[PDB]
Amino acid sequence: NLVQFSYLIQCANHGRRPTRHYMDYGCYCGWGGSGTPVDELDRCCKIHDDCYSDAEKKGCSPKMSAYDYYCGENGPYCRNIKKKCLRFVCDCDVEAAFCFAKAPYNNANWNIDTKKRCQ
User: Fold this and answer.
1) Does the annotation list 33 as a binding residue?
2) Angstrom distance (rounded) from CA 11 to CA 23
3) Are the CB atoms for 100 and 40 separated by under 8 Å?
4) Which of 2, 4, 12, 73 is 20 to 30 A removed from 20 (C-alpha atoms)?
5) Known catalytic residues?
6) Is 75 labeled as ligand-binding?
7) 30 labelled as ligand-binding?
8) Which residues does Ca(2+) bind?
9) Rounded distance between C-alpha atoms, residue 3 and residue 6, angstroms
10) What is the set of domains in the chain, with CATH numbers?
């Protein structure tokens, strides 16, 4: 689920940025599919939204999947092997968490008018 995603985000970035900062960024962060990914960070969010879609096609509800992870000192990692839907959804969230951290944050691309900018 999303509480765990927020935890995987803070682990991969190490406190430097709030999860709130990522939920209304560009055209795709916040899950509204629209236009072109404006940024590197915005492509992380499109890929993540798309990841969660394959998940739902395999029977995995991203919302209802409470998986198992461990936050190490280099960032998060998934511990599921057998419970296959929990590991798939964990991978969507872990790879997005690391993407968000390694990606540059344009403060100018946070909260853009998506009606205009994301067509």
Assistant:
1) no
2) 17
3) no
4) 73
5) 48, 93
6) no
7) yes
8) 28, 30, 32, 49
9) 5
10) 1-119 (1.20.90.10)
